[PDB]
Design a binder for this molecule. Structure first.
Ligand code: ZN
Ligand code: ZN
Ligand code: ZN
Ligand code: ZN
Ligand code: ZN
Ligand code: ZN
Ligand code: ZN
Lengths: 620, 187, 586, 201
RNA sequence: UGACUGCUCCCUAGCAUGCUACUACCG
RNA sequence: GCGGUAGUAGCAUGCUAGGGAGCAG
């Protein structure tokens, strides 16, 4: 906290990797043997050898991921398009990347029009398209890191909020695992910066044996390895016309972050009935179970949801450090005290402030999160819980204590002030008491910066529980953003669920004998997915009929909506599926002579196959 | 599947038993036929099953070892490629200015952000518009980072040569404006 | 882990584990080699050893395959499968083998621990890849033998031409002269530091090297054993006499360096190789120099076998050929750096086979075939792939330092493949013109091996002397001494005034060191001392045993001196063959 | 992919693996192409070959159609039906095929080295499309036997219209007049560079 | 040029378990 | 007379592996 304030005086060219000259068989290299953080000060590597013989495979991998050689063997660059610090240009040309439009499925559009759709004055219309971008879009989108400013925190209050958050994250287990227990899916994805010139992640997960991976992972508990992050543009459907960009982290960072965090990440995504709902599905009655869990037994229930403007471009560094420290608290037996600090330093040097490669040039990332590391959603959930806790603390500590009728709450406020500003060490009994109070009067359900809260209403009116205004104030003074209350909702009737959670609305329908909650999407999104595609994937439905089956699975609960076009969407999808099947069979029987059969294929255009996906009895 | 060790015995016993049956002998020879053929087929059963299990096991082993060999070959070639890339990028370090600024350090360590700033030979500037251009690289030589640079070439967003005589205020709206200026360190 | 087997050239994945060089063996070849020989270890992509925990068996005929690993009789699962069956080992490409019948000779090559003459007989009597494998494993075993020696513990130095140096405990004194190079590396605190390329004189330690270092503490003199790389090209390429002179350009004029050099070119321009069959000082030097300017537009390579024999390699090249046309290749030991190092484009490169800048040519010259093995021929054929080349050298010279053989001497037919290639079908070239030499060597080596194709060019005044003295031999260490040399040098310089400035052939280098300590004569090496001979030389007794005197060590020693060649009859020599003047000692 | 075999009037996706122009032959037509001569390899939308790693089978007469793939004889998972069976080869248009009465059109003129007079004899005893196949195969054989000779090059230059010329490795030289234009390319280090048009007589 | 997670549908191959069936051996 | 065992066929259930596709943060 003090280093953050003091680092704003010193010049910005004295931060980052520290390099020196080493000799390998009489030839000189330039490698990084330390780091200078704005928050953590000066860090020196522990195992550095100047004179050495011919190097091995993992040394080649480490030296090929360091930005030192790439920056030192490049040209100077002065870029006036952005205000962020610039390092070097790797080539003699600047690359401009564009985004192409979508492909039009005319047959589906004609079929939909021939059934009374897209008429004037209708309540269902297309507002999801593929937007195109011009040459200078990647740099324009990268220039949004100017909203990240150095922020000092109230340390005596953060040191209590972190205890409450750790109480929230208490029902799991974690630790370190060996290289043979790591689970990777889709090994056919990109590998990072230097490495995408020779293969995908399969090449590097096959060429490296198990003890090589173990030695590489054990190397990062005594040294710091800075890497390079590549920025890519997305090609997907959306409702707004701004460019979207994701970050591609290097393989040397992901390979070790998996071994560090995967056990805890898998343990979190396997628990039901907790605050974090990552891993729970919405089919087979999952949505109803989540909604019933979040309602708990609150006394005067209302519902509330909020929004984070520029969530990843504006999150201060201190909260990211806090999230990493909270996640790394499960290593009390497998790791020492220096190993944990060096792991934290490696994480900070790789995914918090490092060189990014936009276009064909190297830039310096000021701060924030790089969406695309191995621990994105869980860290976002920790950050969301931290913000909710500090909002509750600020709401309770800023109330006239002479007007609180209940004496228990008055004593709680007195003890809260004493534990914040008059106590130096942790007091577990009051932490447990405050955690119980929060869980009784303020219930949460969190999924990576999306949240729904069921709170006591009279307590919030009297000021003993956080409100929207408290969230606005906390965001203003701790996140450097303004949160307009036009993107937040409030629901005073519990028979209708949250107004929006994970882009889905909620309706209470009668199925069987009882009443359950079902989610339904926006009809415009489903129709836009039907009509606008990437080529070959559609514009010929017979080649892929399984797209429309999934799209009709997503659009089933629209048949219980009081509005009439909403069910017509599902019926139109069923008729299109039947038409595509008939087209395929006849269109194949005609020129060729192969005769097709309709055995157990009619199930796809009858509603009973889709009705079974929302009825509790987990058949897969 | 036809020349198994027990096949000869099984077939010979079957042929002899069926010849005895075709001889129309008493029921005792028929009972002996049935017992002998039953035990013969029973003993042929495992000899026909175990061999088929073993062949599939051997085939799986062969496939796994082949894929291991392919993985090793790929590892060797990627190692060669990485070594070549490193030794190729080594040859542009300008080993006199770099040595001159390394020796001035009190322990050999220097920040990475000041190596291109003090040892690079070429500079690239990207200019949004003309107002920014006339404040940064006006003329033929300009000063930046406490050094003197002289212009060598100017191209546009389409990578076509542009002469400085036509970068003016009147002619500004006729150029693909993300201009890139290349200069060399003077003296 | 995948390649061709040394006999069938078929694809395999099996490596024999009981052969020091780990050759690639075909599955049927693997079975034949493992059955008829106590070579019971086979390597694959994974080793063929029992993986049962706590177990240790390294056979191949004993293991059973089960599950995914390999198991033995004591741990075979119910689902087991023997690896060694059907006379064919289990490995990749098992269905695309052809086998071979040359397994007995391959077994003999593999099993031969290199003891007797038959070792080299069968080394030179086999098919091509077996020749390559035999040469590779011969150099491997000799380098292992010489690396099985101690480290020269040194902590101080007296002065120049003096040294105190100690070997290890249980290790004997290594061989003496530069034929076994002494190149060591000391340590200061953390790594190794340079010492110098040296050689020792006696046991007083004079320095016959070419540098001087601040030698004292922590010094480690060692005969550096080097890892041997595998061969690529065969020992020789079968020649075919061309009709077109492709690339070769006989100039309009005649660059008349030598007269018969025109015929030289005439028959070396068409066949894929040749050889300069040169008696000492008989055009063995500058015929290539004449070829340099008669064929100036031809890429011409020059090489030898040792860094010592570069005299004629380097002198006349700069002496008469143009300055720029020459080029120098030297690792950086101490040798002639007269031309330009670090130059890839040139038409006349002069070096040794130690290290060259990888390129191909169309003309090469290669010196010192007598002490050249098939390994050196293969490496020069691999590094340089040319159209024609000449191997300078003569069978009437010394063998390579093949200290491995002790029973039978290695004769001309056993030098290398080429050295008998020109012995059976005849030499590519045969000269008969001695540049500067009386007819003593003419008579001697023409009655012995030259078949009298060269005759008297310079007159025979019979000033050379050979006496009736015999000598007495005594062994002390791996070098011996001679009392009828300690007394005999004086007894032979008693009154004859002509051989006081003669050169001392050294069958025993320690004896030459003692002679230098007592009376004083220059030390003259035997093997790598051709062309360094002066005008006047003494052939001394120095031995009677089978160390040096059967035929081919004195064929060049008789040519060291020109007029006054004192070659006394030492032992069972070629006494009753010629006429020689004699003076009886008092 | 989908071309046309016309003598049997059959759209096809098959083609002979080892032949002149990758000619298109229907199921029965590829069959009597592969039994009247030796052409034991075919190409379809995908090539027929065992799909297990490390396996190698050029032949098609013993392959099987397995689990959305192809497997073989020496390395045999045989849960399938054979590819080549019942007078036909497996592919599309396996039902709408006719066949050929003149079995040896390809077997006669596509099986020789395309230089005898019999080629042109049969080409004139053809139909319009059959003789089109003939003419295209004559152009193909012209080029494929022209690409079997040397490449002339000038390495040291002399005065124009009187130079020196070395050629290639071991290959023969074609006829001598200006029939063959010597219009090659120049190489600086890896690329091709303006040369012009030449002729050596 | 294509990041990190979570959930769901479809097709094929293998393994394990269970149900039924057909022969044969044994008591 | 009943049970056990050994192969063979069909059917069902859950995992692992491979491929194609959909949604969400
Ligand atoms: Zn740990
Ligand atoms: Zn062996
Ligand atoms: Zn073999
Ligand atoms: Zn064992
Ligand atoms: Zn054909
Ligand atoms: Zn046909
Ligand atoms: Zn196969």
């Amino acid at each position: 906290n003090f280093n953050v304030l003091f680092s704003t005086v010193f010049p910005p060219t004295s931060f980052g990797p520290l390099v020196r000259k080493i000799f390998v068989d009489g030839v000189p290299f330039v490698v990084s043997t330390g780091y200078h953080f704005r928050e953590l000060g000066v860090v020196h590597n522990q195992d550095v050898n100047l004179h050495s013989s011919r190097l091995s495979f993992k040394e080649l991998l480490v030296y090929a991921a360091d930005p030192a050689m790439h920056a030192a063997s490049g040209n100077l660059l002065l870029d006036k398009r952005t205000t962020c610090f610039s390092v070097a240009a790797l080539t003699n040309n600047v690359a401009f990347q564009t985004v192409k439009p979508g492909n039009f499925n005319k047959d589906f559009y004609d079929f939909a029009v021939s059934k009374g759709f897209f008429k004037e004055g209708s309540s269902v219309e297309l507002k999801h398209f593929f937007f195109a971008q011009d040459g200078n879009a990647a740099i324009s989108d990268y220039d949004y890191y100017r909203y990240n400013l150095p922020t000092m925190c109230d340390i005596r209050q953060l040191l209590f909020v972190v205890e409450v958050v750790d109480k929230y994250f208490d029902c799991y287990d974690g630790g370190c695992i060996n290289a043979n227990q790591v689970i990777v899916n889709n090994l056919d994805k990109s590998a990072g910066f230097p490495f995408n010139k020779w293969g995908k992640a399969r090449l590097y997960y096959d060429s490296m044996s198990y003890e090589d991976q173990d030695a590489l992972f054990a190397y990062t508990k005594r040294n710091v390895i800075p890497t390079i992050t590549q920025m890519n543009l997305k090609y997907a459907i959306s409702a707004k016309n701004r460019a979207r960009t994701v970050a591609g982290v290097s393989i040397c960072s992901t390979m070790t972050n998996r071994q560090f965090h995967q056990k805890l990440l898998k343990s979190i995504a396997a628990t039901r009935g907790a605050t974090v709902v990552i891993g729970t599905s919405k089919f087979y009655g999952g949505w109803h179970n989540m909604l019933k869990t979040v309602y708990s037994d609150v006394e005067n229930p209302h519902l509330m949801g909020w929004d984070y403007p520029k969530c990843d471009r504006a999150m201060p560094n201190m909260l990211r450090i806090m999230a990493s420290l909270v996640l790394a608290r499960k290593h009390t037996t497998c790791c020492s005290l220096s190993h944990r600090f060096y792991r934290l330093a490696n994480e900070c040097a790789q995914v918090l402030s490092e060189m990014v490669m936009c276009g064909g040039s190297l830039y310096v990332k000021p701060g924030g999160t790089s969406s695309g590391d191995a621990t994105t959603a869980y860290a976002n959930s920790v950050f969301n819980i931290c913000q909710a806790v500090t909002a509750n603390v600020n709401a309770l500590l800023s109330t006239d204590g002479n007007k609180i009728a209940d004496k228990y709450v008055r004593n709680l406020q007195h003890r809260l002030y004493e534990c914040l500003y008059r106590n130096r060490d942790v007091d577990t009994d009051f932490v447990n008491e405050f955690y119980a109070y929060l869980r009784k009067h303020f219930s949460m359900m969190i999924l990576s910066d999306d949240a729904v809260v069921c709170f006591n209403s009279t307590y919030a009116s009297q000021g003993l529980v956080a409100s929207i205004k408290n969230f606005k104030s906390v965001l203003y003074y701790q996140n450097n953003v303004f949160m307009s209350e036009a993107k937040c909702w409030t629901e005073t009737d519990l028979t209708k669920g949250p107004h929006e959670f994970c882009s889905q609305h909620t309706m209470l329908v009668k199925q069987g004998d009882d009443y359950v909650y079902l989610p339904y999407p926006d009809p415009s999104r489903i129709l836009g997915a039907g009509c606008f595609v990437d080529d070959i994937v559609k514009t010929d439905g017979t080649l892929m009929i399984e797209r429309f089956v999934s799209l009709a699975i997503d659009a089933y609960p629209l048949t219980k909506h009081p509005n009439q076009e909403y069910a017509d969407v599902f019926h139109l999808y069923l008729q299109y599926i039947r038409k595509l099947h008939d087209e395929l069979t006849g269109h194949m029987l005609d020129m060729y002579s192969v005769m097709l059969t309709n055995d157990n294929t009619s199930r796809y255009w009858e509603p009973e196959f889709y009705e079974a996906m929302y009825t509790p009895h987990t058949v897969l | 599947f036809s020349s198994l060790p027990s096949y000869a015995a099984f077939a010979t016993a079957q042929e002899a038993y069926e010849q005895a049956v075709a001889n129309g002998d008493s029921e005792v020879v028929l009972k002996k036929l049935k017992k002998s053929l039953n035990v013969a087929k029973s003993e042929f059963d495992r000899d026909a099953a175990m061999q088929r299990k073993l062949e599939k096991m051997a085939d799986q082993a062969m496939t796994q070892m082949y894929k291991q060999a392919r993985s090793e070959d790929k590892r060797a070639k990627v190692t060669s490629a990485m070594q070549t890339m490193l030794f190729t990028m080594l040859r542009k370090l300008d080993n006199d200015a770099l040595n001159n600024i390394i020796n001035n350090a009190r322990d050999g360590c220097v920040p990475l952000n000041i190596i291109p700033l003090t040892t690079a030979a070429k500079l690239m500037v990207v200019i949004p518009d003309y107002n920014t251009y006339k404040n940064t690289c006006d003329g033929t030589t300009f000063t930046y980072a406490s050094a003197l640079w002289e212009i060598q070439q100017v191209v546009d967003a389409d990578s076509k040569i542009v002469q400085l005589s036509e970068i003016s205020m009147d002619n500004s709206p006729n150029l693909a404006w993300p201009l890139i200026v290349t200069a060399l360190r003077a003296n | 882990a995948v390649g061709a087997c040394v006999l069938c050239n078929s694809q395999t994945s099996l490596r024999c584990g009981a052969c020091i060089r780990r050759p690639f063996l075909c599955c049927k070849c693997c079975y034949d080699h493992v059955i008829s020989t106590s070579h019971k270890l086979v390597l694959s992509v994974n080793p063929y050893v029992c993986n049962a925990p706590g177990c240790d068996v390294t056979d191949v005929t004993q293991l059973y395959l089960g599950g995914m690993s390999y198991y033995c009789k004591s741990h075979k699962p119910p689902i087991s499968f023997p690896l060694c069956a059907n006379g064919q080992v289990f490995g990749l490409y098992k269905n695309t083998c052809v086998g071979s019948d040359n397994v007995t000779d391959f077994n003999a090559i593999a099993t031969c621990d290199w003891t007797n003459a038959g070792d080299y007989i069968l080394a030179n009597t086999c098919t091509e890849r077996l020749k390559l494998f035999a040469a590779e494993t011969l150099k491997a075993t000799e380098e292992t033998f010489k690396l099985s020696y101690g480290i020269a513990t040194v902590r101080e130095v007296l002065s120049d031409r003096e040294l105190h140096l100690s070997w290890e405990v249980g290790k004997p004194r290594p061989p003496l002269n530069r034929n076994y190079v002494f190149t060591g590396y000391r340590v200061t605190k953390n790594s190794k530091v340079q010492i110098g390329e040296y050689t020792f004189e006696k046991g007083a330690v004079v320095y016959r090297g070419t540098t001087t270092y601040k030698l004292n503490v922590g010094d480690y003199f060692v005969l550096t054993s080097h890892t041997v790389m595998p061969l690529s090209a065969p020992t020789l390429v079968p020649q075919e006499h061309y009709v077109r002179i492709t690339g070769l350009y006989p100039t309009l004029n005649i660059s008349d360096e030598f007269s018969s050099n025109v015929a030289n070119y005439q028959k070396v321009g068409m066949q894929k190789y040749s050889t300069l069959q040169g008696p000492p000082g008989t055009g063995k030097s500058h015929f290539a120099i004449g070829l340099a300017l008669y064929y100036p537009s031809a890429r011409i390579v020059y090489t030898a076998c040792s860094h010592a024999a570069v005299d004629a390699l380097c002198e006349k090249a700069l002496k008469y050929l143009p300055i720029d046309k020459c080029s120098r290749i030297i690792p950086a030991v101490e040798c002639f750096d007269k031309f330009k190092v670090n130059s890839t484009l040139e038409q006349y490169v002069f070096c040794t086979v130690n290290a060259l800048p990888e390129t191909t040519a169309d003309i090469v010259v290669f010196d010192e075939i007598s002490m050249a093995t098939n390994y050196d021929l293969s490496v020069v054929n691999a590094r340089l792939r040319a159209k024609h080349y000449v191997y300078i050298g003569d069978p009437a010279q010394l063998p390579a330092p093949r200290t491995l053989l002790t029973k039978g001497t290695l004769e001309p037919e056993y030098f290398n493949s080429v050295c008998r290639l020109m012995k059976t079908i005849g030499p590519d070239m045969f000269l008969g013109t001695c540049r500067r030499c009386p007819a003593e060597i003419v008579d001697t080596v023409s009655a012995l091996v030259y078949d009298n194709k060269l005759k008297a060019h310079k007159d025979k005044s019979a000033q050379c002397f050979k006496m009736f003295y015999k000598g007495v031999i005594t062994h002390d260490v791996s070098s011996a001494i001679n009392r009828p040399q300690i007394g005999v040098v004086r007894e032979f310089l008693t009154r004859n005034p002509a051989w006081r400035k003669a050169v001392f052939i050294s069958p025993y280098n320690s004896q030459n060191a003692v002679a230098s300590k007592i009376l004083g004569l220059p030390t003259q090496t035997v093997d790598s001392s051709q062309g360094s001979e002066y005008d006047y030389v003494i052939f001394t007794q120095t031995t009677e045993t089978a160390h040096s005197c059967n035929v081919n060590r004195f064929n060049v020693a008789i040519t060291r001196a020109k007029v006054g060649i004192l070659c006394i009859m030492s032992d069972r020599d070629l006494y009753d063959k010629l006429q020689f003047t004699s003076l009886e000692i008092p």
